Amino acid sequence: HMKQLEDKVEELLSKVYHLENEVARLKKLIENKADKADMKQLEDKVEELLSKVYHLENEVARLKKLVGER
C-alpha cells in the first residue's frame, strides 16, 4: 500500500525531472530567438535606405530625361 503509493510518486518525480531538463533546453532556445525590438530597428534602417533609394531613383530619372533633350 505504502510501497504502491511511493511507486506512483516516484513515477511522477521521474516525469518532473524529465520536464525540468526539457524546460532548461527550451529556455536556451528562447535566448537564441530574435527580439521584436531588434527586428523593428533593422526594419527601420531598411525603410530609411528604401526611402533614400526612392528619391535617388526619381533624381536619376529626372536627369536622364534632361540629358536626353540635349
Place this chain on the structure above:
Amino acid sequence: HMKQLEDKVEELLSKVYHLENEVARLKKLIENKADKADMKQLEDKVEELLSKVYHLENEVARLKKLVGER
C-alpha cells in the same frame, strides 16, 4: 492518513499532466519565432547596402551638379 496522501498525489498527477501539455504548447510557440542567426544574416546584407547607398548618393549629387538646369 494514507487516503489524504493519495488525494495529494491525485492532485499532483493532474498537475504533472497539465505541465506536460503546457511544455508541448511552449515548444510549438517557440518554433514560430525567428532565430537571431536569421536576423544577423539580414543585418550583414544591410551593412553591404548601407555603403552602396552612400556611394550612390555621392555619385548622383555629382551628376545633378554637372547637369545643372535646362
Place this chain on the structure above:
Amino acid sequence: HMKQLEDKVEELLSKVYHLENEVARLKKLIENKADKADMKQLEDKVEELLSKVYHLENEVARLKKLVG
C-alpha cells in the same frame, strides 16, 4: 517509512510548483520575440532594397557615361 513517503511527496509538491512558475515565465518571455512570418517580410524588404540598388547602380553608370 511514513516520513520518507511524506518527504517524497514534499519533493514532488515543490518541484511541480517551481516548474509551473518557470514555464509561465518562459511563456511571457516568448511574447517579446519576433515571429518567423515577420522576419520573412523583412527578408523580402531587404530583397527589394538590394534589387533596387543594383538596378540604380546600373542606371547611374549609364547616365554618368552620357553626361561625361
